[PDB]
């Protein structure tokens, strides 16, 4: 009974016609008086249909280059499916029917079965391409992760970037590869049984390459704005459809298994049906098993229970863990005490802030809502992600912060990867990578200069516009072969296999999970019909024997995994053990 708003017949942009008849070009403009399409250098006047809709059909095929001409001004297509020359250039006509998919026996992945592995295509490999990423898939499969989480792919200006400056949401960023290269990466992942998720940005457009207002200023509103751009007007149906058509393209046409929606608190909409709800309806209409996740700091269960999203990146856990290990207190970290009792509480509640006052200076308000409705998989936990690394002045990883030992780092992994919540890892985390993940960009002219100036002011700090900042963020695949990188990787492999194989850790019910502390020792207990597991993590700087930890139940006897491989039930400083 929900009916999609989308029909291929009326799709905006350039869409191949059936029967080899060519391509249908369509646009919406509220303000242009003359409207043409320029195809391979030749200008053709478009037909006015009313409602500001203009259309033309021509016998050109996939590969043809085009843009629109509005009152004589050549303007890129916001609906471009590929931009080989970047965001200020001609689009290419793409035919999604030509790729030979081999993934008919893949049927998606459930959230409760996800262990996400966050990839930035530009830094993940030396080449920085989909094709090179695809060659690392067997390594990821064997590692034991189950879903790749790809940072945004929408085209942005410059030769590198995180992806949050995406401006042409439908056009995969050309330096990473052509559309068929992205398709090949997803097909390969599926043939190995890995899911693939995409980070999409529906709260703002980047600062170069967004020509929507040239067509219709009413895509946007001055009613509100984000930190990152003018407000997207979700009261305007064409704006709603820009994002819901984009979501449907990634899932249907690229075979992604789900989307991660960036910064959902800033998708402001006062409409009767919120855009988040309509996104869920539109993706569900595809008749698959695709998932939607929200990156949302509000601790708002309604994203799941009302908007019908599948889960939420819920960072109170991350923050609590980092403050436990470092004691830091700048910015949002001032919201957390850290320590074993604090971490026991945040896990017990899923998130910490359920309506209590958030006292962080400049941000004060009553934050969050009761978490009771949410089940364990609905919470996506991490100890590292692109932001929690890259937002730091030097982009350092958790094991690289002052005062953090590799033992502590390995204990944190054990906690994350034995919890029933849905875990996410950042690329290279699993080998305790030596490289930072720094903020980098490559904007032109004055915008580029302002990025460099802005970064300098907000916090020596690496210049985001320098090539070296990008290169310094590249993964070094050699280093995992040896030393402590290899030892950390063996632990991650061991944790990921237990997560997959242990019949008690299969639990995904908060009803079966309890937590507590004794001094600086955290305990996390799971009890199901299959048995009992307890993770104990010594967050002190002394040694603690498991036998002397005071617990309100009888500790299990059998050692399943010790993060430092010890034979006896004793925890050196920062170490963890799983018993059963
Ligand atoms: Mg074929």
CA separation for the pair 167, 185 (Å, rounded):
23
Catalytic residue among 92, 262, 282, 320: 262
Q: Is 262 a catalytic residue?
A: yes
Has 166 been labeled as part of a binding site? no
Residue with tokens 């509005």: 70
Task: Order across the sheet with 513-518: list the strands.
Answer: 513-518, 521-528, 531-538, 576-579, 559-562
Distances (CA, A) of 236 to 241, 244, 276, 408: 9, 13, 14, 50
Cβ neighbours of residue 56 closer than 8 Å, sequence gap 6 or more: 24, 25, 37, 44, 45, 46, 47
Q: How many domains does the chain have?
A: 3
Nearest residue to 536 (alpha-carbon basis) of 563, 513, 512: 563
Instruction: State the angle between helix axes of 237-248 and 275-284 in degrees (0 to 180), rounded to the nearest 10.
Output: 40
84 lies in some domain: yes
CA separation for the pair 250, 282 (Å, rounded):
12
CATH of the domain at 5: 2.60.40.10
Contacts for 216-220: CB closer than 8 Å, 24+ residues apart: 216/28, 216/29, 216/30, 216/31, 216/52, 217/30, 217/31, 218/30
Nearest residue to 417 (alpha-carbon basis) of 345, 502, 530: 502
CA separation for the pair 358, 59 (Å, rounded):
60
Has 261 been labeled as part of a binding site? yes
- Experiment used for this model: X-ray
Collapsed DSSP state (helix, strand, coil) of residue 122: helix
CA of 20 to the centre of ligand 1 (A): 15
In the chain, count of helices (H) and strands (E)?
Answer: 15, 30
| Angle made by CA atoms 111, 113, 116, in degrees to the nearest 5 | 75
Has 113 been labeled as part of a binding site? no
CA separation for the pair 226, 203 (Å, rounded):
7
Q: Which two tokens stand for residue 71?
A: 């009152």
Whether residue 338 sits in one domain with residue 233: yes
Has 363 been labeled as part of a binding site? yes
CATH of the domain at 342: 3.20.20.80
Whether residue 377 sits in one domain with residue 231: yes
Has 181 been labeled as part of a binding site? no
446 lies in some domain: no
CA of 481 to the centre of ligand 1 (A): 40
Whether residue 245 sits in one domain with residue 376: yes
Cα-based torsion angle of the residue sequence 229, 234, 237, 243 in order, rounded to the nearest 10 degrees:
60
Catalytic residue among 118, 257, 282, 295: 295
Whether residue 524 sits in one domain with residue 506: no
456 lies in some domain: no
Helix intervals (H) in 40-147: 121-124, 130-134, 137-143
Contacts for 454-461: CB closer than 8 Å, 24+ residues apart: 459/393, 461/393, 461/394
Q: Which two tokens stand for residue 10?
A: 């009326």
Whether residue 152 sits in one domain with residue 22: no
Has 100 been labeled as part of a binding site? no
CATH of the domain at 525: 2.60.40.1180
Collapsed DSSP state (helix, strand, coil) of residue 309: coil
450 lies in some domain: no
Whether residue 538 sits in one domain with residue 389: no
444 lies in some domain: no
50 lies in some domain: yes
460 lies in some domain: no
CA of 98 to the centre of ligand 1 (A): 6
CA separation for the pair 395, 90 (Å, rounded):
35
Domain of 556?
Answer: 514-580
Q: Is 320 a catalytic residue?
A: no
96, 126, 157 - which closes a domain: 96
Collapsed DSSP state (helix, strand, coil) of residue 510: helix
Whether residue 150 sits in one domain with residue 9: no
510, 532, 557 - which closes a domain: 510
Whether residue 233 sits in one domain with residue 206: yes
CB count in 10 Å sphere of residue 576:
26
Has 312 been labeled as part of a binding site? no
Residue with tokens 């930890």: 549
Cβ neighbours of residue 339 closer than 8 Å, sequence gap 6 or more: 324, 517, 520, 539
Whether residue 115 sits in one domain with residue 33: no
CA of 531 to the centre of ligand 1 (A): 50
Q: Are 130 and 181 in contact (CB under 8 A)?
A: yes
CA of 254 to the centre of ligand 1 (A): 15
Provide the residue count of the chain: 580
Q: Which two tokens stand for residue 500?
A: 């997959």
CA of 352 to the centre of ligand 1 (A): 51
Q: Which two tokens stand for residue 550?
A: 């005071």
CA separation for the pair 246, 202 (Å, rounded):
10
Residues with CB under 5 A from ligand 1 (ion): 100
CA of 100 to the centre of ligand 1 (A): 5
CA separation for the pair 58, 82 (Å, rounded):
19
Has 493 been labeled as part of a binding site? no
Residue 530 dihedral angles phi and psi, to the nearest 5°? -85, -15
CA separation for the pair 187, 101 (Å, rounded):
6
Nearest residue to 123 (alpha-carbon basis) of 449, 469, 389: 469
Whether residue 526 sits in one domain with residue 494: no
CA of 107 to the centre of ligand 1 (A): 21
Has 252 been labeled as part of a binding site? no
CB count in 10 Å sphere of residue 28:
20
Q: Which two tokens stand for residue 238?
A: 């064409």
Collapsed DSSP state (helix, strand, coil) of residue 332: helix
453 lies in some domain: no
Collapsed DSSP state (helix, strand, coil) of residue 69: strand
CA of 134 to the centre of ligand 1 (A): 21
CA separation for the pair 296, 294 (Å, rounded):
6
Burial class (CB in 10 A: 0-12, 13-18, 19+), 328: middle
| Angle made by CA atoms 75, 207, 62, in degrees to the nearest 5 | 40
Nearest residue to 393 (alpha-carbon basis) of 461, 322, 465, 469: 461
61, 96, 131 - which closes a domain: 96
Whether residue 125 sits in one domain with residue 70: no
Has 391 been labeled as part of a binding site? yes
Q: Are 561 and 578 in contact (CB under 8 A)?
A: yes
Q: How far is CA 164 from the centre of its chain?
A: 11
CA of 102 to the centre of ligand 1 (A): 10
Please provide the DSSP assignment of 340-397 as one string: HHHHHHHHHHSSS-EEEEE--TT--EEEE---TT--GGGEEEES--HHHHHTSTT---
Task: Identify the DSSP state of 331.
Answer: G
Task: Identify the DSSP state of 237.
Answer: H
Whether residue 329 sits in one domain with residue 375: yes
């Amino acid at each position: 009974s929900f009916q999609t708003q989308h029909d291929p017949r009326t799709r905006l942009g350039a869409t191949p016609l059936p029967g080899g008849a060519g391509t249908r070009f369509r646009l919406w403009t509220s303000t242009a008086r003359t409207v043409a399409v320029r195809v391979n250098g030749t200008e053709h006047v478009m037909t006015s249909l009313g409602g500001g809709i203009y259309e033309l059909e021509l016998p050109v095929g996939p590969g043809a280059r085009y843009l629109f001409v509005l009152d004589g001004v050549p303007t890129p297509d916001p609906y471009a499916r590929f931009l080989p020359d970047g965001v200020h250039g001609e689009a290419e006509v793409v035919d999604f029917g030509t790729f030979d998919w081999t993934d008919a026996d893949w049927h998606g992945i459930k959230l409760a079965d996800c262990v996400f592995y966050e990839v930035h295509v530009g830094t993940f490999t030396p080449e920085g391409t989909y094709r090179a990423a695809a060659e690392k898939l067997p390594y990821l499969k064997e590692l034991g992760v189950t879903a790749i989480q790809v940072m945004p792919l929408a085209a942005f200006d410059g030769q590198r970037g995180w992806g949050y400056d995406g401006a042409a949401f439908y056009a995969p960023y050309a330096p990473y590869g052509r559309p068929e290269d992205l398709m090949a990466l997803v097909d390969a992942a599926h043939r190995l049984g890995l899911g693939v998720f995409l980070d999409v940005v529906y709260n703002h457009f980047g600062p170069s390459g967004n020509y929507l207002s040239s067509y219709a200023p009413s895509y946007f509103t001055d009613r509100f704005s984000s930190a990152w751009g003018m407000g997207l007007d979700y009261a305007e149906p064409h704006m709603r459809r820009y994002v819901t058509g984009n979501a449907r393209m990634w899932l249907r046409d690229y075979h992604f298994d789900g989307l991660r929606l960036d910064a959902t608190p800033y998708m402001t909409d006062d409409s009767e049906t919120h855009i988040l709800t309509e996104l869920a309806q539109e993706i569900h209409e595809l008749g698959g098993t695709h998932l939607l996740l929200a990156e949302d700091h509000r601790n708002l269960p309604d994203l799941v229970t009302v908007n019908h999203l599948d889960g939420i990146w819920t960072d109170d856990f991350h923050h609590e863990t980092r403050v436990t290990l470092t004691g830091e207190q700048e910015g949002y970290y001032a919201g957390y005490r850290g320590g074993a009792e604090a971490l026991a509480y945040t896990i017990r509640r899923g998130w910490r802030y359920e309506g209590q006052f958030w006292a962080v200076k400049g941000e004060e308000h009553e934050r969050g809502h009761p978490s009771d409705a949410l089940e364990a998989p609905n919470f996506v936990y991490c100890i590292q992600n692109h932001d929690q690394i890259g937002n730091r002045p030097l982009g350092e990883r958790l094991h690289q912060s002052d005062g953090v030992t590799l033992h502590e780092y390995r204990g944190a992994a054990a906690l994350l990867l034995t919890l029933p919540m849905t875990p996410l890892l950042f690329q290279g985390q699993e080998w305790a990578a030596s490289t930072p993940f720094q903020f980098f960009s490559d904007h032109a002219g004055e915008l580029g200069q302002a990025v460099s100036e802005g970064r300098k002011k907000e916090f020596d700090v690496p210049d985001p516009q320098a090539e070296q900042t990008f290169l310094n963020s590249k993964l070094n695949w050699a280093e995992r072969e040896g030393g402590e990188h290899a030892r950390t990787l063996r632990l991650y492999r061991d944790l990921l296999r237990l997560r997959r194989e242990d019949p008690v850790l299969h639990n995904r019910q908060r009803e079966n999970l309890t937590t507590g502390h004794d001094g600086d020792v955290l305990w996390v207990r799971t009890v199901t019909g299959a048995g009992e597991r307890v993770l104990l993590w010594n967050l002190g700087q002394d040694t603690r024997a498991v036998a002397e930890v005071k617990l309100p139940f009888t500790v299990p006897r059998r050692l399943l995994l010790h993060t430092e491989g010890r034979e006896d039930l004793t925890l050196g400083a920062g170490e963890a053990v799983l018993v059963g």
